[PDB]
Design a protein around this ligand. Structure first.
Ligand SMILES: [Zn+2]
Length: 185
């Protein structure tokens, strides 16, 4: 596919820089994908409504109901816009949590960091899946497909590099994922 005009080599971009800490690298990248997705979803919010998306899905057979096991335990079957708002607000709350993503160098990453990072990442994946399945038309109208595709490719190379999401969670975009990159024959 076509990459954005300003993108670089994504396979190299996701590798852990020599001398850098793994937890910190995942933290920096996770913050970045949250921003990339926030940016992309923002461009199509007027096309993702209560009426266009009465439920959160990535194709009919993959429906998502929101729950975070703390504030909301009983899964909520809401519209995509509300589901994504719940989701992104939840991810942002984790990112702003000083005990999870330490703002001070004298504070180590918590023991459950990786687990929290993986949970964030698997959830962010769902926004890409909904966008591709329900709004690729609006993406094409804005002529921003390169941005969505490059961001998604970057995201997938990153999670594959560190095995951060299990294959099964990626089901709705597995075909696309298998097409990413290329066999050198
Ligand atoms: Zn939608």
């Amino acid at each position: 596919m076509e990459a954005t005009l300003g993108s670089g080599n994504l396979r190299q971009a996701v590798m852990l820089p020599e001398g850098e800490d793994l937890n910190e690298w995942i933290a920096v990248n996770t913050v970045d994908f949250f921003n990339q997705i926030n940016m992309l979803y923002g461009t199509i919010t007027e096309f993702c409504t209560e009426a266009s998306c009465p439920v959160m899905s990535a194709g009919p057979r993959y429906e998502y109901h929101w729950a975070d096991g703390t504030n909301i335990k009983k899964p909520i079957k809401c519209s995509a816009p509300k589901y994504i708002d719940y989701l992104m607000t939840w991810v942002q709350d984790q990112l702003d949590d000083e005990t999870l993503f330490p703002s001070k160098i004298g504070v180590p990453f918590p023991k459950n960091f990786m687990s929290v990072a993986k949970t964030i990442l698997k959830r962010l994946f769902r926004v890409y899946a909904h966008i591709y399945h329900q709004h690729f038309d609006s993406v094409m109208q804005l002529q921003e497909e390169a941005h969505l595709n490059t961001s998604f490719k970057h995201f997938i190379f990153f999670v594959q590099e560190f095995n951060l999401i299990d294959r099964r969670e990626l089901a709705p975009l597995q075909e696309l994922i298998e097409k990413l990159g290329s066999k050198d024959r």
